[PDB]
């Protein structure tokens, strides 16, 4: 799996997402440098505005781009499931609000490592913090928690994001993660470690669409 990322992959993310009842599609297109843990991409909301904020959306719009010191290679399940690829699903509970469900495929196709995702949010409430809008244009720092699921041949995630909210607050986002293989092929067991993640999003000047430019860096520490 290694030997696919060893230079820069173009990347495309397909997203359809119900909200409430609130239905959109995002589209992005980017590359990724798993050297330097780098990931540039653009996303943008097909169908119109977006119903959400941008913010909420980042950790469910490819791990496998995540860079692995050498002395912890042997732990990167995300690219040892390459490239018949992993499924990667999440409940992501927003505190004192609703929740997401995400279910999506990240896979290469031709040399192109695509994320397709299905999002289904439900309980929100319309006067809260995301239907509401009130979440700030940025994005903080996390560790990420990895451990093997022995059981299902994957692996099990957790963590939480802390959205900055226009008041000076933070609105919580606990993240539930499942990982498992689309082959019947082998794949590294971790043992538990985390990962580092920076986020910075902005805007294109040019741009007359509901969008989002990200660029992140992610590094595996913790052995």
């Known amino acids: 799996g290694e030997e696919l990322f060893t230079g820069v992959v173009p990347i495309l993310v397909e997203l359809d997402g ?26 943008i909301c097909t169908t119109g505005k977006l119903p959400v904020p941008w913010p909420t959306l980042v950790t469910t719009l490819v791990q496998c781009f995540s860079r692995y ?22 409940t992501i509970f927003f505190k004192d609000d609703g929740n997401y469900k995400t279910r999506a495929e990240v896979k290469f196709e031709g040399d192109t490592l695509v994320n397709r995702i299905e999002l289904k949010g439900i309980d929100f409430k319309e006067d809260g913090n995301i239907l509401g809008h009130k979440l700030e244009y940025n994005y903080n720092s996390h560790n990420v928690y990895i451990m093997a699921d022995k059981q299902k041949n994957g692996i099990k995630v957790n963590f939480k994001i802390r959205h ?8 919580l986002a606990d993240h539930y993660q499942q990982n498992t293989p689309i082959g019947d092929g082998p ?21 007359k669409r ?11 520490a913790g052995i």
């Open 187 to 207: 794949v590294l067991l971790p043992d538990n470690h985390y990962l580092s993640t920076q986020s910075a999003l902005s805007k294109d000047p040019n741009e």
């Open 69 to 90: 010191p050498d002395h912890m290679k042997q732990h990167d399940f995300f690219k040892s499931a390459m490239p018949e690829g992993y499924v990667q699903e999440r």
């Open 18 to 43: 119900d909200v409430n009842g609130h239905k959109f599609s995002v589209s992005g297109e980017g590359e990724g440098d798993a050297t330097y843990g780098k990931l540039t991409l653009k996303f």
């Open 210 to 220: 509901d969008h989002m430019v990200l660029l992140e860096f992610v590094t595996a």
């Open 164 to 171: 900055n909210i226009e008041d000076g607050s933070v609105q």
